[PDB]
């Protein structure tokens, strides 16, 4: 039976979208059923911020960030802990998991 | 509103649609194709005589463990050969080899009944006399 | 069994039967 | 496309009655709708309707009072012989004490009892009760 009224795709009026590959297993999966995660982070972690600051010329370097949108498959997304199985009454909710920190 | 047409001048397509759909049934298809006359062991026949060829028993299905005592009979009307079942405790011995036996339907519309595989016909009479009269010793086999 | 592989096995039977008929046509 | 206009009118009446309203706005407003609602007025199943001239098919505003429970067209206007009137009443009306199979005879659009009184019968339009 229908487990998802949206079918998981989130297409609703296209018929076909262009697939994208998984970052882990390289699964040719449609771009909308290709759960996306925008990893924006520091090129140097908080573990080495002090070390870099003490041992860097150009006092108060901006310490540029790194940006990458990861296109996971769905099997990896279940397994690589990105997305989790949910209650059938919890599948309703599409909001992100409540603002990890405020 | 519905798949069928509804106009006052749509009798033709309604009739032909019903006529084309009637073939989906099994009774109507059998009656019109005349499969009973051509392929069935008897053509529209409730009873049929035959000659006993050999005297075999067949094991039952899984939930039922036994060997039902049947008999292979070659029909006289056309020459077909069918297995048939002698229905009672001590009736196998009553029918002897190479005697005329009158087979009847098995009651399940020409299909195997119960736990007995590959049989579709009872045995009602043997050598002119009925099985039920022999089983209660009301009549005896003429032994001709 | 899958309908796919039953279909393919039927197609291979048709392979052999078509080659046989073409030999004897 | 709009094939049977009276069907649209009666469907609108049914929908606006089931929801508990007291008025309907029927758009196309032909002769047959006017006669049908006039018969319903004569028998009380409807209130005080209204024709709104548009110079284009007009419209109708229907007032209800909750007395009606179901309209409905017999979309193929079957030729109903005077012998088959009783069969239609049995198949459509819920009881013999009331209900009316509105049918169009050569003497106009009339309820089945009136047609049986005139001893005339024609095609069937719909049913009200």
């Amino acid at each position: 039976p229908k487990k998802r009224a949206s079918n998981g795709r989130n297409k609703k009026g296209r018929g076909h979208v262009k697939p994208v590959r998984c970052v882990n297993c390289s699964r040719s999966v449609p771009k909308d059923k290709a759960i996306k995660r925008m990893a924006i982070r520091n090129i140097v972690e908080a573990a080495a911020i002090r070390d870099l600051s003490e041992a860097s010329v150009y006092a108060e370097y901006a310490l540029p960030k790194t940006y990458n949108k990861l296109h996971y498959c769905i099997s990896c997304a279940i397994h690589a802990r990105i997305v989790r199985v949910r209650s059938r009454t919890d599948r309703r909710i599409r909001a992100p998991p409540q603002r990890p920190r405020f | 509103g519905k798949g069928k047409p509804r106009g006052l001048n749509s009798a033709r397509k309604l009739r032909v649609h019903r006529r084309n759909n009637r073939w989906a049934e099994t009774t109507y298809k059998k009656r019109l194709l005349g499969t009973a006359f051509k392929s069935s062991p008897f053509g529209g026949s409730s009873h049929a005589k035959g000659i006993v060829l050999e005297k075999i028993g067949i094991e039952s299905k899984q939930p039922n463990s036994a060997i039902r005592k049947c008999v292979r009979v070659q029909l006289i009307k056309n020459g077909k050969k069918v297995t048939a079942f002698v229905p009672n405790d001590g009736c196998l011995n009553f029918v002897d080899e190479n005697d005329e036996v009158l087979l009847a339907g098995f009651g399940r519309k020409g299909k195997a009944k119960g736990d007995i595989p590959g049989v579709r016909f009872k045995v009602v009479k043997v050598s002119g006399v009925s099985l039920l009269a022999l089983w209660k010793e009301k009549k005896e086999k003429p032994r001709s | 069994m899958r309908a796919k592989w039953r279909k393919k096995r039927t197609r291979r039977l048709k392979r052999k039967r078509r080659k046989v008929r073409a030999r004897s046509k | 496309t709009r094939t049977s206009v009276l069907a649209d009118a009666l469907n609108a009446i049914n929908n606006a009655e089931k929801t508990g309203k007291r008025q309907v706005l029927i758009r196309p407003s032909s002769k047959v709708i006017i006669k049908f609602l006039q018969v319903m007025q004569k028998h009380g199943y409807i209130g005080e309707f209204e024709y709104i001239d548009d110079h284009r098919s007009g419209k109708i505003v229907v007032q209800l009072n909750g007395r009606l429970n179901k309209c409905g067209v017999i979309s193929p206007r079957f030729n109903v012989k005077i012998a088959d009137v009783e069969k239609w009443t049995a198949n459509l009306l819920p009881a013999r004490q009331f209900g009316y199979v509105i049918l169009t005879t050569s003497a106009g659009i009339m309820d089945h009892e009136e047609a049986h009184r005139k001893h005339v019968s024609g095609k069937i339009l719909g049913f009200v009760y």
Binding site: - | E54, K55, I56, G57, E59, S65, A66, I67, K69, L92 | - | -
Partner: protein
Amino acid sequence: GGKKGRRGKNDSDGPKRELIYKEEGQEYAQITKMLGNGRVEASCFDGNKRMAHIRGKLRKKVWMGQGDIILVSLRDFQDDQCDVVHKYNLDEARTLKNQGELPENAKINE
């Protein structure tokens, strides 16, 4: 082994049973080949190869393999087929071998 055993009848006849002989149609035979559908092929000690049904009280109650002495009941109406009725566990089979109810040319020993 398994949890099946506790569901069983627990019919423990381990002690030496008294072997059953052949009676007016019941005859000894040897399993030649194992077939499917719970049916076996038995070479009887008469020069014939009968087809013997794995039979009630014997189907999933005792497990029998190739080259097993066996007792089988015939059917007078059909001689070709028969029914396996009892199985001898290789000890009383030796006793019958010495007493020689069966031709001794059929030597089956571990």
